[PDB]
Amino acid sequence: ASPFRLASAGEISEVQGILRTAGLLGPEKRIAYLGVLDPARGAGSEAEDRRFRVFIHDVSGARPQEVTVSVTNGTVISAVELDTAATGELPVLEEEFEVVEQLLATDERWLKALAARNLDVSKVRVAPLSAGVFEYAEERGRRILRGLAFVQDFPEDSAWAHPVDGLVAYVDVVSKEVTRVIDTGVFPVPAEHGNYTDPELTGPLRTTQKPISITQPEGPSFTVTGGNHIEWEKWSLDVGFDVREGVVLHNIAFRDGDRLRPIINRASIAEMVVPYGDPSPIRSWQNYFDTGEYLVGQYANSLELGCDCLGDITYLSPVISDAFGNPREIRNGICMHEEDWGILAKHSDLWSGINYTRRNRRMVISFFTTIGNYDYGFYWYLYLDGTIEFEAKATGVVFTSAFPEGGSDNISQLAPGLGAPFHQHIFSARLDMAIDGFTNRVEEEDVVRQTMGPGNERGNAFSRKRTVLTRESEAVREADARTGRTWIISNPESKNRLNEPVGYKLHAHNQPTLLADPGSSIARRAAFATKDLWVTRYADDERYPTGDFVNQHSGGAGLPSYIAQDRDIDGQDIVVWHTFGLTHFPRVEDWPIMPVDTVGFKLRPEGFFDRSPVLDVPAN
Template identity: 60%
Template sequence: MTLQTDRRATQTTHPLDQLTTEDFDAVRSVLEQEGLVPDTTRFAYVGLLEPSKDELYPTPGPGTDRRVRVMLWDAALSRSLDVALSLTSKSVLRQIELDPSVDGQLPVLLEEFDLIEEILAADEGWIASLASRGLTTAQVRVAPLSAGVFEYENETGKRLLRGLGFRQDHPGDHAWAHPIDGLVAFVDVENRRVSHLLDDGPVPVPEVNGNYTDPAIHGELRTDLKPIEVIQPEGASFTIEGNHLSWLGWDLRVGFDAREGLVLHQLHHTLNGNRRPIMHRAAISEMVVPYGDPAPYRSWQNYFDSGEYLVGRDANSLKLGCDCLGEITYLSPVVADDFGHPRTIPNGICIHEEDAGIAWKHTDEWANSNEVRRNRRLVVSFFTTVGNYDYGFYWYLYLDGTIEFEAKATGIVFTAALPYKGYEYASEIAPGLGAPYHQHLFSARMDMMIDGNSNRVEELDLVRLPKSPGNPHGNAFTQKRTVLESEQQAIRDADGTVGRIWHISNPESLNKMDQPVGYTLYPENSPTLAMADDSSIASRAAFARHHLWVTKFAEDELYAAGDFVNQHPGGAGLPAFAAQDRNVNGEDIVVWHSFGLTHFPRPEDWPIMPVDTTGFKLKPHGFFDENPTLNLPASTAGHCSPTGCHDEN
């Protein structure tokens, strides 16, 4: 049997608790009192402004200010505001008006998803272009696509979306099967008009079936699947109070943000009564999906799903037995709608345990012993839908001290009409239907705190040694350790040929071997950003050009591509942070790790893509003095052999 518990925060008891419905109502009330929310104002973002570390450690004081950041867009005034306010004092602390040509635009609003179709449905040029293809606006859905920054005329400082059309044959039809190629609309959503229409004439619309639940595609459903039941008759091994989660030595606070989604706060591990900090904050600060097709209808395609579209705001409500399996506890985070009103996402966060295979095992004939122990992991996850793609964000904590992040990508690949067989920049995934090559690149921001704030990063490389008098058989190899001293030196790339890893340690905290305690980051060695170094996307998504960045902690440096990503000209975020070239050896540091998928779509990715995964691991490296799972009991006889998982002799 599977169980679920839904916990919705109703009272704020800690400064890092998630924002509640009452908080959102209070935010709007404060802004109304200041005259900042006329009827034309929309809320592009509302999120917790977290207290400083000084306010949180060793424990937060009773008077810790509860602060919120709000981004307001007013189309009537053509005004973007970045506002900080205090819920404690019920006052606005600061407000900054942005210059869109320099600072960029605020994130895409939910209402703009529909607005682009409304604008195009009334545009004579768009209507005529569809008519030349034998189509009407009623037959066409338009994808609201972020515009980026390019050399197109008369776009600087304007709030834009670009629209690609897809024919929808009936209300339940998955229109991605029918891309309308050779046509793209550049839409000024602020002034509600089409600023430019690129139409190179009709292209045959692919006539494939993309309805993956249609029996005509999937045939008879399987009948040979036997049930798999996940049961925990004594309940789960974790507890949660408010947003404070404890599990078998681990404890943390589960946060949620409309932009980043899941945020892990104050991650600690306790062994033998010794509670130790590992990370102050961990989140996926940005993700970008750049496309590699140079055709004029798609060469501008690159989407920042966090900074432009807000992955947390678009989180799914999860279903027991479908999205999550087992003894489940759900959290229901609250986000703001376009009008600043609270919107609860029921069951938006899933927390549960999973078996994780063998923890350790050995059969020793000398000692006449045969022992095996099973591992398990705690899973904290959410799923989000951004247009055609669906993403799962999974944080795993293991009994052996390992921390893992995994992103799961599924949904429907972006489609186009294939220009010709063997097109160099797309895969043919169905007859006449192309899927352009693209990437899904993420940036994890990890505010490290291993046994305190004095941390550093060393790069560890395998070194192959030639034959020598000291290495007569040529079998010797060793490891090179390089301390990354400054932010510029700490811009690094993975290298699988030397097994490159990065060791994050505290030189002021030593283990029983008198070595600094630490954790090691193991990258996947996946490709970095594929676009030309002097391209617009390379400037705007510079974080994705390298696998590792290390910066000195600063409270306002949260996002790898900067605060205002939508139509930002570039250079913000990590390039600007690292340009200060601050010392990062033995300091309060933030480790940023870029990773992701480079997707050359397969026919098997159509009409819906099986889950593909990417991620990284952080493993304890000298953090413990020995294997921390030695105290695991053997599995009971009811779950394995009659004698259990160890010899009785």
């Protein structure tokens, strides 16, 4: 019944049938993106209209199309032909990745380069990577992938240990042509293996770890209804899944007495960019938009009970489309569970003689994706006290290169001759706010230091100031950790019992933003990543900070174009976009497989409630 339910296998098959009947999905067509559209604004609106958005690629070279379908009514709502040289290429297809290595294996320039290095072409794996937009005029309007080579000594070998530096090739994956092969010189291929399951490298496994058993004898405290609606410890929300964004949270609300109070209408990671900081021409083009170019939901892992998710686990198995419009289930792709989270509140009072302790817990919703060498975990947490938190966990195998003789200012050494280029991992969280409803505003809060003198004679006073962001042109903000800068999202028309507007405060980690030169291609394509906070007025078609078509798209779309409308955001339906990320100078301990590192943000209530919301938690 719910309009926010997960897409079903039948819905995806029905989209396929509708597209076929309409003449839009013949043998030369491929589905590059398919996802369900959120309901338009309007409580109630259509009784039920499930609409899907589809990006359709054509392998013969014809123009691709963007199509909206109503599965409820069996109709195509709109279909537009795309001019990709203008608006961007479609996301990379999984079938295009394998094309790269196969085409290079028969190219005489590639074979000549490998022969100069005494490498057997049958052992050379090619990582197929997104191309970006640089100086090559022949790439405009064409679907290009760039390939970097790694040697696999045997079928179970980790090829990442053996980069073939000095060599890169560019491939047109539609016409099946190798456009350029660039060879800047022979580097030694690092010889040490990186096989982290080889006993020669692990040594004998530890026998010292005793088991930790986490069980829930009476079952979990949350309920799941309608497939994806969660109720847990006064929280209410719907768990969505989109092949581009991954897990999406809808309708986050908190039951305060007899009233269900909205907090966030939609929360997602709407883009993530991984820019590399090595100026070598072999890699200076390298920037992954994992969300916009690759689609992170497509590569979600099946999560194993007792290994990936420990405890009393409830799974969701989302369904996505393959490239022909057939439904594909990602079995056990989303883990949901609650976990203990230490002390919630504690006080031992001398005067009253009362000793009081309560324990905290959090609800966890997570998925993991694998994009080539990297593996990312996406974790959303809900806490008893009203806190909402997101955490990204980065692991996998670092991307490698040769380590130059004489050293490098842009590459770490991991092993003899083996380097790891400096890079960042930067996320954009899109928070469609609904603090007690849709009339919201954002204030920037800084600590204020005060000078000793009249009215502050002992020089101890300090204060704070809040600045309302009234229009989009002034809502592009930077962090300032020194002044304790945070941002408050409040509802000026909903007041707590002290007659103050209810609100939530966003706490950032204040990590560095995009480091690239402001004139670079990546700074223009990932403009969102250059500032910590953006606020826009809600609009149906403003979904991603980088725009709809990120692959091989120059600047011109996304947040800088949205903000130019300079719309009123003071007590309006607004969207917060928060940039946060990790700057990775790889260390020896990251090799041969990287221990998890983390980054995130959290939101805490700020006068949203009339007192602590966890006074009714029992002692157990």
